[PDB]
């Protein structure tokens, strides 16, 4: 063999490609032709039979009153379609049909409802937005081509060429066509040349390491390597200056492309996926929290964001030292080879249970009798490894009160100027001297929150909830002692605000428990989620499309609705607004959430009926940005008594200019500066069907459908190369369940965990890997001190009962 | 006989300008033959201008000078909108023909054509409607493609009268104005395409035979791609399970297939649909086959490209296939420079069979191959030339001007020029090759084709376009010389 000889031989083998292609296409045409369908739904008679030609001769006078239209007919004959004569013109009477229904007010995209704000990815323009026809070499052609150029200038500026995209697409198709031929051809040639040998040669050839390192790590370098000769011959035949180098095929190959204190280190390594992805807020591994980088890489709001497992696990152990037997042959008759994964299970459980509930019973329930794990635990001989600060003059965490020049001493309540930083996770005090971001990252200190690793006893910036307690209504926008939470523009914490009682009232299961909400906490409206009854209609403002109308009486001070949508950056907002624009001729659904941070809410597609509230400087509702369990949210509050049937309005603010109807940096958007269909002169619509509503009829209220959203989160997990199939399986199952609960507080985690354990009892005990992955979750939640011991004891009973029933 | 016969221009008409007081503004954007008449009934089509619906009947004549086209109905949409879309349905009670017309106002007007009345209006879209298609499995099911970027599925059945929108194809599948919508023969799959250059395949659920307070909303297509074309897509159709589509600036009609797609397989549910997880993947599919040497197997295969020269920068030009059991499948399309093209798809197979036999005989007989036309038997031809000579039967339609004849006067094989000319029209070996039309007819004047229509028996092909012009092609005519 030589290059010349291989190339000559590949040229003959390559003849199979157009031969097989023609066989495929022809076979497909013939199968389609054979399976042609019989016409269906044919009428018994010709419905047109009784209808005569309406033609009136050209020579006749035109009919009186009725409109007439001319048609000129030509007859043709021969091979070249020559006209038989100049033609004949006829007059036809016209049947004039007036439309009787107006269209609904205009819109773009399908408007779907979301219960909560959803996180969006950054996007690129992948097409040519056609607006109208433009005459060649005109002012309009120039205006249009300048707008397209501006759009292209935003994508280059985003951080993410036509001729190359066309060439690449054409090369990708030709690579897919040739890839099934490589191995049959290599066998036919029988050169002492295999795909593995050709991948090895490619890896040992320029041109990026450590990607080439990763490949050689699995492939190695291994007599006479004439992989070079085959590679050259292939490039001579298939990569002519539809072309493809052997490299391009090999890079897309299934065996190539995807390859692009000891106890504690084992535990850290074992829990990696859970600590890296597990959300501190909602407990899901793919959710609406976290940050999206310019390249669409995601930084989850996880344990990793706060230093990983160890800083949190060490603090738990300290908090422990400063403070019934199981129904599975408990260690009580104390003291089959144990696999590596079984040893590991006992290890991460032992570590996270800490200086406590015993790991034995739980490990036995996940894996084995309780005594078996007790003696292995003794065989393995496993072992576990306040500088008084002055109170701030502007804040008292014991009394839960703000004082002095506090409005100037902090920016905790000034969400518009806040920049987001990871919760603090350092050892020493929370000061500028010790690099604490809560104390020093902003223009003024902000309070330390629930995820900061410091505690209320040692830290003077630690938020400790409000002191409010009343047999009547409390945590009011105007109170004896005022509500610190209301003053800081935040909702009450179900855990920190004890006895107000945000615990019961921020619980969605009590949303419509009217007797409960008549007393206690009045500062959990977003968490409660009970919006006022509203109805879509046509706005009273002239040529102003849709508007939102009250469908019940709303008293001044009442929560109306939340503004939901997609969470996007300022830059994504600019890209979106410009792509949807028209340089030759208005509607925006943007809302600034966090001005300084650059977080906007876009309700163009996903949101709720609040996206339809029109502008009025003198509105009857008022938006406000609230901090709600480390989520920033927009709520609307009534600023007048509103009657059922009245249109809702709010002042959009200073950053939305041309709103005159009454009665790259510049981004316009809103900013903070038996239920029946109600009686109104205005047409009212069902939000989905767009059918009109009749006043006096039941108000349509469709439950939110989030199965499409749960699907997206499941699929996001499935596409991770970093996750192992056994992990994907458990994480997808846990998230499908937990995402539905819309959790933002640890207070409700134990109840939902128990319900998960009770429901998935059978699924979990059925496969050894599920129980293993489940124990890793429990370990991460215990390390975080979020999961109480009592629920882990209960889960042991539920799991031990699940198997055995399975026998 | 005459199964190989292709159409010839028979009639043409110009319908009076109806838009000049509201680029030359008057166009016939659509043409649709009535599909529910009994077998053998005179074919009827509706041609839709910006303001009118022209309903014609075609009758075969024995007189070359006689007019086969008669206008039996002429309706004016007395609104202040330009129409561009139509499809046929039937009254669920009387079985009378219903003509649906839609345009830039965003409403579907449903006309009782025999009586000249408005039967009903379908209201709900947020922008102009660009295309309409009736389901082949249910005549009461209509899909509309709109500038609002969604597809609405409507039912004219009495049980859905109060709320006729049964389904909305929404989510983020499409991001710009939709130009084309098409149903599979089974009525469960829908193809959509437009300005965003994405071609989406959606799976429709079964619609209950009762009042639906809300339509069923579909968030994800089961197959999605913006990779078949590099430009806006203005025409999409199924051809059995295969797909036909055209884009602007390409001068082709692309025949392709979704890998792993079979309409014999159970219909996937909404949650089987892939989701756009990676923004860098411009193709996604639920159908993808699991066996391939590629890590991410190919999700579609370009099969062939019908050459459609001189479309230039023009868009909103639609092609149409004649696909009926017992007759040859014929593709028709008119370009932006006064030409009508025809392809007889059954020619491909006979040509392929003839060239396979010709290639086999050349190798087995060292080029000693005599070709004889079909219409003399193979057996009797073999006796004439002897055992040393290979005999190949050639289709009679394959007319002269695999290796070429050694010299011009050789008794074996064909000239390079003959073989090249045939390959241009019939060779299907190259997915990025250009298939020359089997018939190309010149049109007098300047004409841009908008839509093509075939009669149930395929004897008529109507092409409509600019200047409100209709071109009527015929085959298997009764004209006497």
């Amino acid at each position: 063999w030589t290059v010349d000889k291989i190339a000559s031989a590949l040229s003959v083998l390559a003849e199979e490609v157009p031969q097989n292609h023609s066989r495929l296409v022809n076979f497909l045409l013939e199968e389609t032709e054979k399976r042609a369908p019989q016409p269906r739904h044919l009428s018994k008679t010709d419905p047109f039979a009784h209808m005569k030609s309406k033609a009136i001769d050209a020579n006749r006078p035109r009919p009186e009153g009725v409109p007439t239209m001319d048609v000129k007919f030509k007859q043709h004959s021969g091979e070249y379609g020559k006209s038989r004569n100049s033609g004949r013109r006829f007059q036809y009477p016209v049947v004039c049909i007036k439309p009787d229904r107006e269209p609904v007010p205009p819109y773009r995209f399908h408007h779907a409802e979301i219960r909560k704000n959803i996180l969006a990815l950054n996007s690129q323009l992948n097409f040519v937005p056609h607006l109208r026809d433009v005459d060649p070499n005109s002012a309009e052609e120039q205006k249009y081509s300048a707008w397209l150029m501006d759009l292209e200038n935003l994508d280059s500026k985003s951080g993410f060429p036509r001729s190359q995209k066309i060439a690449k697409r054409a090369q990708a198709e030709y690579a897919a066509t040739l890839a099934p031929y490589l191995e049959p051809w290599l066998r036919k040639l029988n050169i002492e040349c295999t795909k593995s040998n050709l991948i090895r040669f490619m890896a040992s050839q320029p041109e990026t390491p450590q990607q080439k390192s990763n490949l050689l790590d699995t492939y190695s370098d291994d007599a006479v390597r004439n992989a070079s000769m085959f590679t050259e011959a292939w490039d001579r035949v298939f990569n002519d200056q539809r072309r493809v180098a052997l490299r391009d095929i090999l890079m897309l190959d299934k065996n190539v492309e995807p390859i692009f204190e000891a106890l504690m280190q084992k535990v850290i390594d074992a829990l990696g996926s859970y600590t890296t992805l597990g959300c501190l807020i909602c407990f899901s591994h793919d959710c609406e929290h976290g940050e999206i980088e310019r390249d669409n890489q995601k930084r989850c709001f996880s344990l990793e964001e706060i230093g990983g497992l160890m800083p949190s696990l060490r603090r738990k152990w300290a908090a422990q030292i400063e403070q019934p037997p199981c129904r599975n042959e408990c260690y009580i008759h104390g003291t089959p080879p144990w696999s590596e994964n079984e040893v590991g299970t006992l290890e991460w459980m032992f570590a996270t249970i800490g200086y406590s509930l015993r790991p034995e019973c739980f490990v036995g329930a996940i894996l084995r009798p309780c005594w078996d794990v007790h003696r292995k635990l003794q065989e393995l001989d496993l072992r576990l490894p306040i500088p008084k600060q002055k109170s701030l003059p502007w804040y008292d965490r014991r009394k839960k009160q703000l004082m002095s020049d506090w409005a100037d001493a902090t920016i905790t309540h000034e969400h518009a100027v806040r920049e987001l930083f990871a919760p603090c996770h350092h050892d020493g005090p929370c000061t500028a001297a010790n690099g604490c971001p809560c104390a020093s990252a902003g223009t003024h200190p902000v309070l330390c929150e629930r995820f900061c690793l410091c505690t209320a006893e040692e830290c003077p910036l630690k938020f400790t909830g409000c002191a409010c307690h009343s047999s009547g209504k409390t945590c009011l926008q105007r109170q004896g002692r005022p509500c610190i939470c209301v003053q800081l523009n935040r909702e009450c914490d179900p855990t920190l605000c004890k006895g107000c009682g945000a615990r019961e009232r921020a619980d969605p299961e009590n949303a419509y428990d009217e007797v409960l909400h008549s007393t206690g906490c009045q500062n959990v409206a977003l968490q409660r989620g009970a919006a006022k009854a509203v109805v879509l209609g046509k706005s009273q403002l002239e040529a102003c499309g849709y508007g939102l109308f009250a469908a019940e009486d709303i008293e001044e001070g009442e929560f109306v609705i939340e503004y939901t949508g997609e969470l996007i950056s300022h830059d994504e907002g600019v890209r979106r607004e410009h792509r949807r624009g028209d340089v030759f001729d208005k509607v925006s659904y943007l809302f600034t959430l966090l001005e300084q941070e650059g977080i906007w809410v876009d309700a163009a597609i996903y949101g709720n009926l609040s996206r339809y509230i029109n502008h009025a400087t003198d509105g009857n509702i008022m938006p406000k940005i609230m901090y709600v369990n480390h989520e920033w949210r927009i709520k609307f509050t009534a600023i007048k008594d509103i009657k059922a049937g009245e249109e809702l309005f709010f002042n959009y603010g200073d950053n939305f200019p041309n709103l005159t109807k009454k009665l790259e940096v510049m981004l316009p958007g809103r900013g903070v500066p038996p239920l029946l269909v109600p009686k109104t002169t205005q047409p009212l619509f069902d939000p989905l069907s767009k059918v009109q509503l009749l006043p006096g009829q039941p108000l349509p209220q469709h439950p939110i459908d989030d199965s499409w959203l749960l699907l997206k989160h499941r699929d996001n997990l499935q596409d991770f190369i970093d996750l192992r199939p056994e992990e994907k399986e458990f994480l997808q199952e846990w998230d499908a369940f937990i995402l539905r609960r819309h959790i933002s507080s640890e207070q409700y985690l134990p109840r939902y965990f128990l319900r998960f354990v009770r429901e998935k009892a059978d699924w979990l005990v059925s496969k050894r890997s599920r129980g293993e992955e489940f124990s890793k979750l429990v370990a991460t939640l215990l390390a975080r001190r979020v999961l109480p011991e009592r629920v882990v004891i209960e889960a042991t009973q539920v799991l031990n009962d699940a198997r055995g029933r399975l026998r | 006989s005459a199964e190989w016969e292709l159409p010839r221009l028979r009639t043409s008409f110009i319908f009076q300008d109806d838009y000049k007081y509201l680029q030359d503004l008057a166009e016939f954007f659509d043409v649709k033959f009535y599909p529910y008449s009994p077998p053998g009934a005179p074919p009827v089509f509706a041609a839709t201008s910006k303001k009118h619906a022209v309903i014609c009947r075609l009758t075969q004549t024995t007189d070359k000078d006689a007019n086969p086209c008669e206008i039996i109905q002429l309706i004016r949409d007395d609104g202040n909108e330009a129409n561009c879309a139509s499809c046929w349905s039937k009254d669920p009670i009387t079985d009378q023909p219903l003509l649906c017309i839609a345009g830039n106002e965003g409403n579907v007007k449903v006309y009782n054509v025999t009586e000249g009345k408005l039967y009903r209006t379908l209201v709900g879209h947020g922008g102009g409607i660009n295309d309409l298609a009736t389901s082949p499995a249910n005549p009461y099911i209509i899909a509309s493609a709109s500038d609002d970027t969604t597809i609405r599925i409507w039912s004219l059945a009495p049980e859905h009268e109060k709320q006729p929108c049964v389904c909305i194809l929404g989510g983020e599948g499409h991001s710009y104005d939709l130009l084309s919508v098409a149903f599979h023969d089974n009525g469960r799959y829908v193809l959509s395409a437009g300005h965003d250059q994405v071609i989406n395949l959606w799976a429709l659920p079964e619609f209950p035979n009762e009042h639906m307070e809300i339509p069923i909303v579909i968030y994800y297509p089961h197959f999605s791609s913006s990779e078949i074309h590099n430009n806006l897509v203005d025409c999409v159709a199924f051809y059995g399970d295969l797909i036909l589509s055209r884009a602007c600036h390409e001068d082709t009609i692309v025949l392709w297939r979704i890998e792993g797609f079979s309409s014999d397989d159970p219909i996937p549910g909404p949650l089987d649909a892939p989701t756009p997880t990676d923004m860098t993947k411009q193709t996604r599919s639920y159908f993808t086959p699991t066996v391939s040497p590629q890590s991410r197997p190919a999700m579609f295969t370009r099969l062939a490209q019908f050459h459609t020269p001189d479309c230039g920068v023009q868009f909103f030009m639609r092609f149409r296939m004649y696909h009926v059991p017992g007759k040859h499948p014929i593709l028709a399309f008119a370009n932006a420079k006064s030409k009508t093209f025809f392809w007889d798809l059954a020619r491909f197979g006979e040509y392929a069979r003839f060239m396979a036999d010709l290639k086999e005989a050349q190798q087995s007989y060292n080029g000693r191959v005599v070709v004889v036309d079909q219409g003399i038997s193979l057996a009797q031809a073999q006796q004439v030339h002897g055992p040393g000579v290979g005999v190949v039967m050639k289709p009679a339609w394959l007319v002269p001007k695999v290796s070429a004849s050694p010299d011009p006067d050789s008794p074996f094989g064909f000239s390079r020029e003959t073989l090249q000319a045939w390959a241009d029209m019939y060779d299907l070996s190259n997915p990025v090759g250009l298939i020359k039309a089997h018939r190309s007819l010149a049109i007098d004047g300047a004409f841009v084709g908008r839509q093509v229509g075939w009669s149930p028996e395929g004897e008529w092909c109507v092409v409509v376009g600019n200047g409100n012009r209709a071109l009527i092609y015929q085959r298997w005519g009764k004209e006497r010389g």
Binding site: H130, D133 | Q23, E27, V313, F315, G465
Partner: peptide
Amino acid sequence: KAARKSAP
């Protein structure tokens, strides 16, 4: 350069 919907 730019696509056109109307007849030329």
